[PDB]
Design a protein around this nucleic acid. Sequence first.
DNA 1: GAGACGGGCAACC
DNA 2: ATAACGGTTGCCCGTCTC
Length: 993
Amino acid sequence: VRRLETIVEEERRVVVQGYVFDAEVSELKSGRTLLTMKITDYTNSILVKMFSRDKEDAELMSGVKKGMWVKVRGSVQNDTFVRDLVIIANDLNEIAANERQDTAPEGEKRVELHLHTPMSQMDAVTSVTKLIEQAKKWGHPAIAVTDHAVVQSFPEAYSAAKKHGMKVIYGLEANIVDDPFHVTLLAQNETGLKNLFKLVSLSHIQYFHRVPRIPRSVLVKHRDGLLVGSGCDKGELFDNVEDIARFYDFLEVHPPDVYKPLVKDEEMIKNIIRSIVALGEKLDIPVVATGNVHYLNPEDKIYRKILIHSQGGANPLNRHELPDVYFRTTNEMLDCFSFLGPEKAKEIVVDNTQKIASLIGDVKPIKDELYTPRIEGADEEIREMSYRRAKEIYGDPLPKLVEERLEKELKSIIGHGFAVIYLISHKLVKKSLDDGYLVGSRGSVGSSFVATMTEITEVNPLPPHYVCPNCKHSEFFNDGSVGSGFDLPDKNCPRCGTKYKKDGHDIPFETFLGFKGDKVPDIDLNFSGEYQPRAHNYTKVLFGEDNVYRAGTIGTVADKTAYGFVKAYASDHNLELRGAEIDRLAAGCTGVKRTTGQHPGGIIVVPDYMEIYDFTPIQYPADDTSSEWRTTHFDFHSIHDNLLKLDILGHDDPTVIRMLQDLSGIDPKTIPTDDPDVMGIFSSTEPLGVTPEQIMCNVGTIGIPEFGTRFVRQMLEETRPKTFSELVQISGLSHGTDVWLGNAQELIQNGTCTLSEVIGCRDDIMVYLIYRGLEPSLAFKIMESVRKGKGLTPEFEAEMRKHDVPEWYIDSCKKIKYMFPKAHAAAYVLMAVRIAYFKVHHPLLYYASYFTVRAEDFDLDAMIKGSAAIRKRIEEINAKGIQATAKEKSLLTVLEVALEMCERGFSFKNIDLYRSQATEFVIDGNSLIPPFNAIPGLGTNVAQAIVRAREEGEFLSKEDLQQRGKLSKTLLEYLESRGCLDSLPDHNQLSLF
DNA sequence: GAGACGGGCAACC
DNA sequence: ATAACGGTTGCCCGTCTC
Ligand SMILES: Nc1nc2c(ncn2[C@H]2C[C@H](O)[C@@H](COP(=O)(O)OP(=O)(O)OP(=O)(O)O)O2)c(=O)[nH]1
Ligand SMILES: [Mn+2]
Ligand SMILES: [Mn+2]
Ligand SMILES: [Mn+2]
Ligand SMILES: [Zn+2]
Ligand SMILES: [Zn+2]
């Protein structure tokens, strides 16, 4: 039985063990089956191939899973396609993991009181879930979580606590400074827990230095409910006569090995530990043997080594070799301390450890319920706001339809405590408008007609209908035969003669709030990127400075970065590693916290009768103390269920159509949604006056948000939507993995159902399951499950089958990885159509707005040279296929729209010293003049300076332009070489004040 | 050696 | 071409310029 680190050359026969961390199966022309595994015994790893000799072995091959352990007897060959050595197996036996066993008697088990999770930035490697699971297996009565400076593992510890029935002790390793050493804080109760949240807040905010820190006095202030340990070798007392110690409720001692970096020798460490023992008995302070766990098993160490090493001589913990700090069993802990005698062994390893755990109650770090804000007048105001607005559109009294929609909608919104955020949402939209920035609708609030009446969405969820903007008469359609009111043919009020307005997308209110109101949705708004910060700030004014917080995020090491760290470490250590082994080192690194950041837009609202510390600590994103916003210490996901969120988002659609409006004088709300020429671009280039050959594309949607992508263009080619609601079906099908490809697309092509019958929004799942007989709340639950890509449980399938829901439909639900709500699809489609109207009728406005707002990657020389030149760049990038760099892809998107622009008869002029603007593409006859910031290296600040300076006074020489415009040599050259500066002298022979 | 700038990446909707 | 979910904010860090 060979360890995998000894497999080094081709070799006739080896027997090998290892965890299978990857397994796939494929079929050969011959009919034979091939199993391909990666396995590691944790000294190294290797790829393994096995060739089936019969269908019995072929199916056993399918039984091999990630997580199994396997003994393989095989040959070792160079595989020249995988470019590494590889085992060709003829023998595979599954085997026990036979892992470290905790052999002490039941009730005589150890409790770990000092332990680090992947949340100890770049320092610890095994997830808290795995650790807690291991403690459970070992029979530990409890386990502690004590991360450095943070409590970000709490949410996951809790979950695992409940799933596994393990008692968790919620703690902190804190940096205390006297008014810079380590202590262990263990929370005994909610008081303690809130004090923890507080201390981590103060340490990240008022007292952050290079590292979150806590003055001792502030610790004392917030000590109630905490047990304080003297902790580490970087502890106060280990770092040495006696008063210091009386400060701790417990005294820590690590296994002698853990201290090995140094002191004279192991015998002295051993002495120091014995004096801490002397001290503890002397002062009646329990002494505890703690592990300082930074990973599960002895071998997991290498992952910690790789992370730490990535930091460089900057961390200098790389100065010394790293201690064995794995999760030690209760029998092995005794072994480590056998030198103190068997009575003291048992005392500090189990009796005292157990005793400290006994002093800890059962704390719930994350709350169960939702706490909802109160602002006097709100329930009342949302009611009147919406009845008033509804009456002026639909008449007095209201049609039964509308009236019933409002009654049912309000009692839910009001009763489940959402009236406040509707209102705050309405003011945000109102102020943005008044400030000159229109707002784009998004997400599930468009399922709510009250939301429509409060002008928080442009989406009207009522069934399709005509309404007169004058006489107010209404015509609704519930035949279901008509998809969206926007599909209706233009018509006149048969009563006043006035031309009818059309609306209604037939969306059920429940998509938003469900039936129980056990769901907590949010309100999503698309503000323009330029405006987003201001909308954010307005919520401070509305709720008060201390009752809102930006949701914070935790940046972890994901695959690409992990791979990056491992390769470098290999390189620096001169290791030649196999793909398989690099893979497995990579995997052991992912999950580890590297930084913190900011939710892209969500603001979390704290009810005035609670406080943020009932829910999470707070801090600064990335620890920037000059940040305008404080962030939540837990991310939004951990507290999803406790506080409402306003998704105040940034998006280009509002900005673009704002510019389209400010350039044309046209009110986008007046734009028709059934303009044949506009809608034609979704299935043809005709409306654009160009050939498919001319623009290398069969449909007219280049540049159109969502629809301009290569994937979506292809979908359009095959579906040819013309109707608003057909576009809405496509919007749904084109967003989310396994929605179209391998799912709907096949169902349509098999003829197993029609385009319109295929599942195109989460709503249709609910509406159809109710139709088919199921209980609405259950139909809701099922919709919610598939649209989160969670598939179907057995109970769901059973309820579906029991109601004649066809197998192809059930099977289609199980595929969907993600899925729009109809209201979002309608909102986006409406936005895309408004823009399309400019693409078609005001092309230059469309392009000026596109390159101004959306593009950030150019090849200006190509663009200026024109059609043939652009085409050549594009073909260059096409040749690279899916081997194109993210940036080439970004550029390809923009060149595609340049080539189309040029073919439609327009063009690009060179940067122009006196006509170019800073950041905006301007219209000049049939051209666009590029702005300065389009030049590579020339970013916004310089662009703005060049314009400022020129407005202060024109440029008298290249030199003058360089000084006043703040231009580097390279940038100056850029302009020179292109003839931009030709009309200027290099320098002036005079200069005056 | 501090400050633009852009790429590369992670979180998120 | 293949297969293909689209689009947004924000942080780090190497690079290139004084
Ligand atoms: N293309 C795409 N769009 C998304 C994705 N996630 C969210 N969005 C868009 C569509 C959603 O309706 C909206 C995201 O809103 P939320 O995350 O608040 O969820 P949504 O509002 O759909 O449901 P909710 O009722 O809030 O639980 O933005 C995604 O993975 N892909
Ligand atoms: Mn420590
Ligand atoms: Mn520690
Ligand atoms: Mn939402
Ligand atoms: Zn540590
Ligand atoms: Zn009328």
